[PDB]
Amino acid sequence: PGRAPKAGSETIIAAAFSSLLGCVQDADADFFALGGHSLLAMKLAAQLSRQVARQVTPGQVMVASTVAKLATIIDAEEDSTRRMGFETILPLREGNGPTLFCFHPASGFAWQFSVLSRYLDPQWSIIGIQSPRPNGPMQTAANLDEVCEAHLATLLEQQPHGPYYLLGYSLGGTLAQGIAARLRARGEQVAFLGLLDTWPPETQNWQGLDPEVLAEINREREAFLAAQQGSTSTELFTTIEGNYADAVRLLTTAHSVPFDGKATLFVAERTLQEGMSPERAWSPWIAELDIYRQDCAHVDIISPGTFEKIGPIIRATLNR
């Protein structure tokens, strides 16, 4: 179906794809559904950038996962594509059916949710909710409640009526659960609330930028990204560092609210605390809980590997 790469931009993009994924044959080839991810996109962007003498960003690849779409981004006035992939709304995939809204972790970016592309049926749109800088809610919020309220308003703009399907990872899980609670108070239906190894802040606050390891792994991808030789831009990681600091700040102001609905929790078994089971931690704030234990650590709960099992479970849960 579709066409084959056109002369110029599309051809240059397809060749780039081939080099990375190991195979582009048509203009409608999706970078992520085939196996790509944000890091492999950072390579593409830097590659094409040095190749066409233009600022190509990883963010552009995240929202234009197609040879066709990315080609259009490069062909268009580069003054209108500067913030692509860095805005509140992150269109990972547009479908002609329901929408799964995915909430960002402490980094404020929802790029990691691209892993869902290979699992959700075609009709589904996969829309990430982010917190850009400056002026994203994480930066301007005095407390986490303010961030939940801001994202709720964003969500209602994107889809004014339910039912709603929400997915959150870590901090995003906290936000998703708080948003679900608010939607229910509005008499709206929450058909799906997915939590990727999310815990009530109360089971953690009873205890500053920590762990340092959280800054280490951030530094890990720091090098991974620069591995493709950062080309004059550092907006990505300065944004991440800034949001991390605010996430830490906000989590101390975090208080859970009761959600009278069912949540689907994916637990990272390797980092579970002896004595605090997921069922016990969430009992006061989630009415019904379906738990799926994964053999991984917290950080890897959203990894493509872990998702070889989580992805199908989410698809199965959503189909009904």
Swiss-Prot record:
<comment type="subunit">
    <text>Proteins EntB, EntD, EntE and EntF are the component of the enterobactin synthase. Components probably do not form a stable complex. EntF acts as a catalytic monomer. Interacts with the MbtH-like protein YbdZ. YbdZ binds to the adenylation domain, but does not alter the structure of the domain.</text>
</comment>
<feature type="active site" description="Proton acceptor; for thioesterase activity">
    <location>
        <position position="298"/>
    </location>
</feature>
<feature type="modified residue" description="O-(pantetheine 4'-phosphoryl)serine">
    <location>
        <position position="38"/>
    </location>
</feature>
<comment type="function">
    <text>Involved in the biosynthesis of the siderophore enterobactin (enterochelin), which is a macrocyclic trimeric lactone of N-(2,3-dihydroxybenzoyl)-serine. EntF catalyzes the activation of L-serine via ATP-dependent PPi exchange reaction to form seryladenylate. Activated L-serine is loaded onto the peptidyl carrier domain via a thioester linkage to the phosphopanthetheine moiety, forming seryl-S-Ppant-EntF.</text>
</comment>
<protein>
    <recommendedName>
        <fullName>Enterobactin synthase component F</fullName>
    </recommendedName>
</protein>
<comment type="similarity">
    <text>Belongs to the ATP-dependent AMP-binding enzyme family. EntF subfamily.</text>
</comment>
<feature type="domain" description="Carrier">
    <location>
        <begin position="4"/>
        <end position="78"/>
    </location>
</feature>
<feature type="region of interest" description="Thioesterase">
    <location>
        <begin position="98"/>
        <end position="320"/>
    </location>
</feature>
